C-alpha cells in the first residue's frame, strides 16, 4: 500500500486449464464455482485458531469453525446425525449422534462415549416401540449420570432421550426426550433360575420391595404376577423350563406422574346435598367414615349442577371423602 | 532435482478482475477482505468425498460430506423455525420447524416424502388450541408408528418432532412437549346437521371410544356423556349445529397404568394395642390405610412422617384388624 | 475478433507467497495441504446470494445465505451448552443452553430480547433442586405464553427449550423433560417469621391453590395439609423459621378400572361369579363398603376368567369390581 509494486499484476484477470499450487491468497472479489466444481476444507485438529477460520476434523468427522470465544466448534451449531443401530448386546455410541434402537429381537445395552466437553450429547429412540417388553440399558462406564455411576434401564415403549454431559459432579443428564417414566437402576438379581416343571409361584431368598421379572428374557407386565412378602405368584402359569429372573431395582423418575375431604371430615347432620367447590369431571365414588360407595347406585351427581346428592340423612360429624 | 512443469511466481501474484481457475491445491492462509464474497459449489449428486462441502439447490441446505453418513446439513440437523399460515392442509419440509396457528379452526399437515433416515419435521401448538382444533398429521403412503393412517393431536400447547425411522416402522416422535394421547380416527359412525335443540342422539352402533365435533370444534370429554349406544349432551346442542362422531384408536407416548400399591401389616392380623405402625421401605405418600375393608384417611384415621416411615393412628388398635397400608408413592 | 481477453495457463501454475485476487470462478477441485488455513468473509449485510457463506463478527456465528431464510446459521439447531454459575438473576443468550445449579437457594433467569421467530434458549436443572428451590423464567416485558408475567419451574429433573413465535403468543416451549405444571405466582398470601415451633397455621384468607416456602426452601406439596382456611404441617416446623405462602396460577404444559354385577345389586347362593370376558390381574371387590382384597375372600384365574369368591353371599348386598391393565373385553 506504498512505494512501488512487489508482485506481478494481471489487470485483465487470468484463466487456468489445470490445478494450480497456491501458497494461499486474499480474495477482494467473489468466489464462484462453475458446474462440477468441488470444494473441501483443510483437515486440522489444533486447539489454537483465528476466528473466521474453518476446518474439517478427520478425528471428529465434523465441520468446525474457530469462534471469537468458544474457539473451535461445530459450524452453525450441532444437531442430530440420526443413524439406525443393528441390534447387538453392547454398542458404544458417539457424541452428536442419534441412535434408532431395534430391541424387537431382545434387550440390548448401549454405552455412552467418554465425555470431552460440557454439553457433549447422545440420543437414543425406541424405533420399534419394544422397550417395555425388551428394555434398553444406558451405561456411562465410570463417567456417571444423575450422580450414581451405575447403569439405568429405559423400560417405556417409543421413548427418546438426549443424554447431555453436565460436567463431572452430576454427569450425564436427559435434556430432551419423549415419554419418560421411572428410569430403572437395576440393584441385584434376587432370583435367577431355569424352571424344571410348569411352576406358578416360587419363594424368594428375601422380601422384594420393588422388582421387575423377566420370563424368557422378555419382561412381564406388573399385571402378570401377584407379589406377597417373599413369594412371587404368577398369573398366568409359567411354562416348564422358562428361564426366569427376578430383579430388585431403584427407580429414578424423569417424567411427571387424589381424594377430596368434605368440610374437614365433620358433617352437619340432616344434610344430603354435597355442593363441591373444586369443579372437575367424572366422579363415581365417595367414602363415609371408612366405608366408601359408588355414584348412580347410592349417590346422584351431575357435573352441570356441580353439587353431589346423598341418600340417608348424613350423620353429624361424619368422615366424608369425595373422589374425582 | 526434477525440472518442474508449471510457471512459478515466487512473490505470488495480484489480479484486478475475476480469474477462471480449473481448481487449485491451497498450501497456505486463504483470507478475504471487505465486500469479498464466498459461495460453496452447487451439487445434488450422491458420490462425494469426506471434508468436501456444498449448497443443495433442491434442499436449500448447506451440506458437508461426512466419513460416516455422507452429504448432511453441517453439524447434523437444524430447526428451521417458520410460522405457518393457517390452511386446510399444508405439505411441509424436512429440516424446518412449523409454528401452527389453529385459532381459526381445524387444519392438517402432510409430511415430506422421506429421502434419508432421520429426516425430521417439527410442529408446535404455538397458540394453545389443538384441544379445541386438532391438527391432523398425514404420513401419506409412508407410515407413522407402523401404519399409513393419519394421526391427530388434541392437547393444548403440544409440540413434536417427527423423525424418519426406516421404510418399516416409519415416522416417529423423537422429541417434543405436552405429548398426550395420539388419536387415529376410525369410521365416522354419526355425522348430521341438528334441525332442533338436541340433548341426545341415537347411534347405529355403540362406540368403544370416540371424539365429538360440534360446528367443526372438538367437544370437551366432560361435556358429552354416553351410555350403551346413546350420546347425551349437557348442555343441549343448539339447532343447525354441524355434528360429527368419530371412533378413534388411541396411540400413547408422552405419559409414563400404575400409581399406588398393595401392602399389609403384621401378615394380615392385628397385634392389638398399637397406634404407631412402622413401615419397612421409605415412601413419598401414605395418604390413607385400609382397616378390614373401609378406608381411614390422613388426619382422620392417623398421621405419618416419610423419613421415619412410621404411621401414627388416632385410636388404640385391637386383635385381627386387617390393617393394609396403601402405597401412594406415584 | 474471437481473441481471448485474459492470459491462459494450460499447465496451471505455482505461487510461493500470498496472492491478492479480485476473486475467481472455480471450474476444478479446491484442495488443501497440511498446515493450510481457510476462512470465511466478514459481512453484516442483510442482503446476500444463495450459496453465499460468511462469518458474522457481531453475531460471532458462521452463517450461510439460505434461499428462504436469508443469512442464517449453517446446521440451524445449534445448542451451545455452558454451566451458568448460580446468582439471584442472570441474563441468558439466544442459542445457548444453560445447566442450572439451584443446589443452594433459588435463582432467576432473564430470557433475552427476541430478534427473529425461532430465537431459542434452553435451561436445565442438572442437580434436581427445582422441586426445593425452583427457577422463575422472566421474559422481561416480552410476554411468554400470552402474558408478560414471570413463570416458575418446580419440576425436579426438568429441562425446557423456549422458542419465540412472535409477540402475540410470545416465548413458548418446544422441547423438554418433566415440564409438568408451570407456576405463575400472584399475591403473597402469608409473610411471617415463626414465633416458635407450630403444628398448624390459620391463613388470613382461604386459598384456592398455593405454594409454601420455609427458610428459603419450598415445602413439598405432601408436607403441608390445607383444609379450608386452616393449614396443618406434618411434621411441625421448627421455631424461628421464615415462612411464606403465595397464591399462584398454574399453566399446564406436559400434561403427564370400573365394573359391577346383577344390575348394581346381587342374588343368592353365589359360590363364584363368571367374569364378563377373560382379563388380567383382579385386585379386590367393593362389598358393603369395606372392599375385601384378593386371597382374603375370593380367588380368580385369568384363563378361567371367573370370580371364585371364597364363601357364599346372602340377601340385600351390593358388589363393585376392580381389575388391572386393559382387557379390551
Author numbering:
A (entry chain C): 1 to 257, 265 to 331
B (entry chain B): 2 to 257, 261 to 334
C (entry chain A): 2 to 257, 265 to 337
Copy text verbatim from the article accompanying this structure deposition.
Each TSP recognizes a different lipopolysaccharide on the membrane of a different bacterial host.
However, the SeMet TSP4-N335 containing three constitutive methionines and three additional engineered methionines designed to increase the anomalous signal (Leu12Met, Ile31Met and Leu145Met), were all twinned when grown in KNa-tartrate solution. However, the electron density associated with the XD3 domains could not be traced. A linker (Gly179-Leu-Gly-Gln-Gly-Arg-Val-Tyr-Ser-Arg188) that connects the XD1 and XD2 domains exhibits a well-defined conformation in the two TSP4-N335 crystal structures.
